[PDB]
C-alpha cells in the first residue's frame, strides 16, 4: 500500500529536482565564455623511459615531493623510482598477483595496494632494520577492491564491488564508517584537497558525493549511459571529471548540481581508461583504448594533442604538485616521463 | 659519467643490483600456464577432485615439466565483466558439464576446453589430465607459428 504512495512521492521529488536544475540553466559554458584563446598546439616528448616491469601496468601514483613514484603491475611487483636519474630505490613483492590499485602516504612513510583478494595491505618504508615490511591488513569487504587513498598516517578510505565504501583505523583495524546506497559495482574515487569529502562512480551509471565526518549521501549525478571507469577532481574543490565506456568524458560544478560540458569525437569510438587534470585546470589528460593518450583542453571543449609513443593501451596517468611532469603507464609494460 | 659525486655512484650500483634480481624473477616466471575454470551452477568439483585435489581461490598442480595454475570465479554467476577486466590474456578456458563467452571481442582467438576440443569424463578417466596437457601444448604451437610469421 505505502509502496505506491512512496513511488508517487519519489516521482514528485524527481520532477521537483529536475525543474529546480532547469531553473538555473542560464546558457552553455561555451556561450558565456567565447573570450578564450586556444592554447595552441601542445607538443611533449619522452625525457625519460622507465624500464623493468615485465607485464601490464594497472596503476601508478606520485610522491608528494614531485620526485618519487610507486607503480604496480601483474608480474606481482611494486617499484619505487627516482625520476631525475632513473634510479631504482626499492622493490616490493606482493602476496597476490591480481592487483588493481596503489597509493603513497603524503608524509613519505607508507604505501598501499589491493585487488581481487578482498584485502588492503599497508607497508612501512622507514624501518630501523633496512627493509620494507607489511604493517596492516584490512578485512571485511565482500567483493573485490578498487581504489584507496590515505588521509594521514592513521586513516584510509577504500571502495569495493560490494556496492559499498568504507573508512578504516589503521592502528586498530576496524571500519569506523560505512557508506551504503549504490546498486552496482563502485569503480573509482578521488579525495578533495582538504580531505573532508569524496566522490565515487559505479556500474549503475550514477555517481554520489559523500562526507567523511557525518557519513550520508549528499548529492548524486546522472548523465552517462554505460558504466563509469575513471573519476578525478579539479583544483577548486568544486568540480570532478568522469570518463566512461560510451566514449565520453564530462565536467561539472557541485554548487550548480548539473552537468556542464562533454569531451567526445567521432573518430574515437573506444572507452576511456583514465583521466587527470593540470594545475590551472587547463590540461585534461585522458588515456584511451586506441593506444594513444590524448591531451584535451578544458574550457573550449575542442582539442586532443596526442601523446603518442606507446604501442598498446594506456592504463594510468598523473601530474605532479609542482606541475612540471606527466607519467603514463601502459599494457606494453613501460612508464614514460613527459614535458 | 665524470660529473658524479661519491654518493651518486653508490645509488647507481644498488639500482643495477635491483635490475639483476628483477630479471631473475622474470626468467623464472615466464614459463607458467594460467587456466580460467568456469561452468554453470553445479555443473564442476568433479574434475577439481580428480587431479589429487571470500577472495579468489586458486589451485596448483604440476605435470610433465609444465607449471599449472588454475583459478575459480564461480561465486559470481551474474553477468560478469568486472572480472573480465583482468583475465584478458589467459591461455585457455576449462568447462565442466556460452554465447557471451565464445563470441566476444577480447576472446577473439581464445580456445576453450570442453567436457561432456571435446572429451568424455568417467569415474576412472584419469586421462583428463593428459587431455588438458595435450590441448595446451597444441595452443602453444599455434601461438609460436603465428608469432614467427610462418603461418
Amino acid at each position, epitope marked *: 500500500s505505502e509502496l505506491d504512495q512512496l513511488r508517487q512521492e519519489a516521482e514528485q521529488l524527481k520532477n521537483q529536482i529536475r525543474d529546480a536544475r532547469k531553473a538555473c540553466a542560464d546558457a552553455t559554458l561555451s556561450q558565456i565564455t567565447n573570450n578564450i584563446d586556444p592554447v595552441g598546439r601542445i607538443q611533449m616528448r619522452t625525457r625519460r623511459t622507465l624500464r623493468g616491469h615485465l607485464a601490464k601496468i594497472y596503476a601508478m601514483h606520485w610522491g608528494t615531493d614531485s*620526485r*618519487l613514484l610507486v607503480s604496480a603491475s601483474q608480474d606481482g611487483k611494486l617499484i619505487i623510482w*627516482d625520476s631525475y636519474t632513473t*634510479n631504482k*630505490v626499492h622493490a616490493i613483492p606482493l602476496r597476490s598477483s591480481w592487483v588493481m590499485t596503489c597509493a603513497y602516504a603524503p608524509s613519505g612513510n607508507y604505501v598501499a595496494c589491493g585487488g581481487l583478494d578482498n584485502i588492503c595491505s599497508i607497508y612501512n618504508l622507514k624501518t*630501523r*632494520e*633496512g*627493509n620494507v615490511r607489511v604493517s596492516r591488513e584490512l578485512a571485511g569487504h565482500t567483493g573485490y577492491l578498487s581504489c584507496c587513498r590515505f588521509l594521514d598516517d592513521n586513516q584510509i578510505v577504500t571502495s569495493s564491488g560490494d556496492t559499498t565504501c568504507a573508512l578504516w583505523d589503521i592502528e586498530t583495524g576496524q571500519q569506523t564508517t560505512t557508506f551504503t546506497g549504490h546498486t552496482g559495482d563502485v569503480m573509482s574515487l578521488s579525495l578533495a584537497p582538504d580531505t573532508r569529502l569524496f566522490v565515487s562512480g559505479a556500474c549503475d551509471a550514477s555517481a554520489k558525493l559523500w562526507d567523511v565526518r557525518e557519513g550520508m549521501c549528499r548529492q548524486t549525478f546522472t548523465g552517462h549511459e554505460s558504466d563509469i571507469n575513471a573519476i578525478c577532481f579539479f583544483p577548486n574543490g568544486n568540480a570532478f571529471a568522469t570518463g566512461s565506456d560510451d566514449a565520453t568524458c564530462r565536467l561539472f560544478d557541485l554548487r550548480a548540481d548539473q552537468e556542464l560540458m562533454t569531451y567526445s569525437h567521432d573518430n574515437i569510438i573506444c572507452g576511456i581508461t583514465s583521466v587527470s587534470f593540470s594545475k590551472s585546470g587547463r590540461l585534461l589528460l585522458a588515456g584511451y583504448d586506441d593506444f594513444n593518450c590524448n591531451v584535451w583542453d578544458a574550457l573550449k571543449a575542442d582539442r586532443a594533442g596526442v601523446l603518442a609513443g606507446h604501442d598498446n593501451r594506456v592504463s594510468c596517468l598523473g601530474v605532479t604538485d609542482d606541475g612540471m611532469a606527466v607519467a603514463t603507464g601502459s599494457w606494453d609494460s613501460f612508464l614514460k616521463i613527459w614535458n | 659519467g665524470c*660529473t658524479l*659525486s*661519491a*654518493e*651518486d*655512484k*653508490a*645509488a647507481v*650500483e*644498488r639500482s643495477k*643490483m635491483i635490475d639483476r634480481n628483477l630479471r631473475e624473477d622474470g626468467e623464472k616466471a615466464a614459463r607458467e600456464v594460467k587456466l580460467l575454470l568456469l561452468g554453470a551452477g553445479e555443473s564442476k568439483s568433479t574434475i577439481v577432485k580428480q587431479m589429487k585435489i571470500t577472495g579468489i581461490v586458486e589451485t596448483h598442480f604440476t605435470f610433465k615439466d609444465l607449471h599449472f595454475k588454475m583459478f575459480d570465479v564461480g561465486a559470481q554467476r551474474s553477468e560478469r565483466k568486472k572480472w573480465i577486466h583482468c583475465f584478458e590474456g589467459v591461455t585457455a578456458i576449462i568447462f565442466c558439464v556460452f554465447d557471451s563467452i565464445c563470441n566476444n571481442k577480447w576472446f577473439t582467438d581464445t580456445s576453450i576446453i570442453l567436457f561432456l576440443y571435446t572429451h568424455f569424463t568417467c569415474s576412472t578417466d584419469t586421462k583428463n589430465v593428459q587431455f588438458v596437457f595435450d590441448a595446451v601444448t597444441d595452443v602453444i604451437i599455434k601461438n609460436n607459428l603465428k608469432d614467427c610469421g610462418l603461418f
Partner: single-chain antibody
Amino acid sequence: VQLVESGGGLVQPGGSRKLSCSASGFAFSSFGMHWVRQAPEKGLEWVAYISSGSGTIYYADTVKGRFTISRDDPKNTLFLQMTSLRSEDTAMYYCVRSIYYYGSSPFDFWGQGTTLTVSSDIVMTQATSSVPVTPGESVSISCRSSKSLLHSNGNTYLYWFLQRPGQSPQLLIYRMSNLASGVPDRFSGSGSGTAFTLTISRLEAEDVGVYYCMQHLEYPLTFGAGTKLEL
C-alpha cells in the same frame, strides 16, 4: 641493532693481526661498511671501504697495499687483514654502518671499538682546541674547509659527530644541515661554503665531549682535530 667486534691485543714489530666484526639485528647485506681509527690522544682517522654487493674497495693513502678488507654475507661478519705493523699503528679501531640511496642517512650507527697496541686533498681545520662552558648558555662550535664542499647537484657533504667521555661516536648532523633520528631537537648547524658552524641551545649536562667534523665529497675522507667542551 648491535655491532660487536674483537681481535685486539699487542704484537711485536713486523708481525700481523686480523680483526672481525659481528652483526645482528638488521639486514646486513644491503649496507656498506667502513673502518675508522683513533690514536690514543689525537682525532679520528678513516681507513677503508667496501660496498653492498662487493663491487668497490677504497684504501687510505697511508697504508694502502698493506691492509685488506673483505666480508661474508651469508653469515653476517666483516673482516680486515693487515700486515707488517709499524710503531705508529697503535690506536683503537671501529666499525661503522652505511647505506646509500636517495635520502638515506649514512654513518648512523657505530660499534664499540677494539684496541690495538704496537711497541693534494681537502683540508679541514678545527677552530679552537678547547672552550670553557657554563650550563644553560647557548654555545657554538666551528671548523673550516679548504675547497668548497658544495656540489653541482646541490648538496654539501660535511658531517658532525659527538663523543662522550668513555663511549663511541654518535651521528648528529649529516650532509651539513640534517638532524639524525633519536637526537634531541636542540641541535642545529649551518654555514657558508668553506665556513661552517655547529650551534647548540640550552646547554645540558651529558653534553661534554669532543665535537668532530668530517667531509665526504671525494675519497679519502678527512677529519678535524676536535673541539672539547669542559665540565
